[PDB]
Paper text:
To further probe the basis of isoform specificity, we solved the structures of SOX2 bound to both IMPα2 and IMPα5 (2.7 and 2.8 Å resolution respectively). Consistent with the cellular and in vitro binding data, we observed differences at the SOX2:IMPα isoform interfaces, with that from IMPα3 being more extensive. In comparison, the IMPα2:SOX2 interaction interface buried 1082 Å2 of surface area, and contained 4 salt bridges and 24 hydrogen bonds. Although the overall structures of the IMPα isoforms were very similar (RMSD between IMPα3 with IMPα2 and IMPα5 of 1.5 and 1.9 Å, respectively), we found that the ARM 7 domain is positioned differently in IMPα3 compared to IMPα2 and IMPα5. This region is where the SOX2 HMG domain interacts with IMPα3, but this interaction was not observed in the IMPα2 and IMPα5 crystals, where instead the HMG domain appeared to be disordered. The position adopted by the ARM 7 domain in both IMPα2 and IMPα5 would generate a steric clash with SOX2 that could impair its binding. Furthermore, Pro106 of SOX2, that induces a sharp bend adjacent to the SOX-HMG domain, would clash with the main chain of both IMPα2 and α5 ARM 7.
SOX2 is essential for the neural development, and the self-renewal of undifferentiated embryonic and neural stem cells. SOX2 is one of the key factors required to convert somatic cells into induced pluripotent stem cells (PSCs), and in concert with Nanog and Oct4, plays a central role in embryonic stem cell maintenance. The localization of proteins to the nucleus via the classical import pathway is an active process and requires a cargo bearing an NLS to be recognized by importin-α (IMPα). Humans harbor seven IMPα isoforms (IMPα1–7), each containing an N-terminal IMPβ-binding domain (residues 1–70) and a C-terminal NLS-binding domain constructed from ten armadillo (ARM) repeats (residues 70–500).
Residue numbers in the entry:
A (entry chain A): 72 to 497
B (entry chain B): 41 to 45, 111 to 118
Amino acid sequence: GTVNWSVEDIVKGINSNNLESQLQATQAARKLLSREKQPPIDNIIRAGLIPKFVSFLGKTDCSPIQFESAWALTNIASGTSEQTKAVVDGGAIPAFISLLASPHAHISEQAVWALGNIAGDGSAFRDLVIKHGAIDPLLALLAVPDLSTLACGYLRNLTWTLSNLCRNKNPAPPLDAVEQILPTLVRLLHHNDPEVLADSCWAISYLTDGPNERIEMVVKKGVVPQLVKLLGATELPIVTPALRAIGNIVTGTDEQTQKVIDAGALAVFPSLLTNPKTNIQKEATWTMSNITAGRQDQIQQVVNHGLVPFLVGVLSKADFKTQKEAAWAITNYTSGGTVEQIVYLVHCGIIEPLMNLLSAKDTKIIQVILDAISNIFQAAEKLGETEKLSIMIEECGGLDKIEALQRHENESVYKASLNLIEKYFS
Amino acid sequence: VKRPMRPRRKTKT
């Protein structure tokens, strides 16, 4: 029927003065734009059909043509930034916000989807959707006693669209918009659906990627325990945004970091530091490096949970980017730890894998390792056992590397390497 | 110091 129409035929039917002929053509346009193989988006745009589709959004007496045009515009707005702009330039934004209150649920859901694609383009369109007043009617669709009474797909689109309203930086979303969304966002974070949980964590992930004032706004709502629960989930699409939000929170103040520790987050890191996914292992190591940059009683809590051997292991064998994050974790550990905490780091076997990474073809990891060695030697002086540590570095072949790092391109590497061999001779 | 260092669009078929 409406299968495999030409663009010329679609134009001929939409330009007729017959609402049912226009409905037939719009459906044929929707079917073209919903094919997997190269949807002719640019061809439809050049034909001048976007303004006609936008007007069809307002024909309340013919809901089938509201739905077909919203679907067609949804898919145009899913392409490039130039194609999303054509949808916006046609006046689609206020029309989709009006459709949010449609008594037909499949039409309201389609307006949510279209507004999600518009806001996902970037900061500008995101704020423009907010200025047109989309948040109030969006949150009204979720003001029910139990979210389980809503349709699964209806709820997944609402969570996804909302997350796109929390997304992107330069600038971040308006503070008032974030404060207005968070209570509903926290409720979604306790829902049972896997996709709702994943997209809710991504939203919290975005809101925590910024200054400490943004982090505190989230922490104040008490979502940190629930983030730790999801951090130990089985589903990979949930663990990934959950860890990102935890890692974001520990970039802030020591008090905000301590709330992550109090919720039991460190108990999950034996698994996270041995996760078979390279990206989970790296982000977990990065998070550990920001935790060892805190107070001494926090470094001690890292020790108590037994995570120092896991850092030794990651330093011993992992993807090179994960290894560098582990080198940072050690240098932060050594620069802010006590004497008892620095020697315990040696008793766990940090020295050998730390020396073996001095053969890396990277200058920054060399500087980080060498500065860690300096802080370790400084603690050996305080005890008067520098001889033992220098012997330890020589026996494993670390001295050969340190002295080979003399003849290095970078000046800073040479100076630190020399200063080390002059003070302790190994 | 501390060191500070998912589809945007969906098509309906």
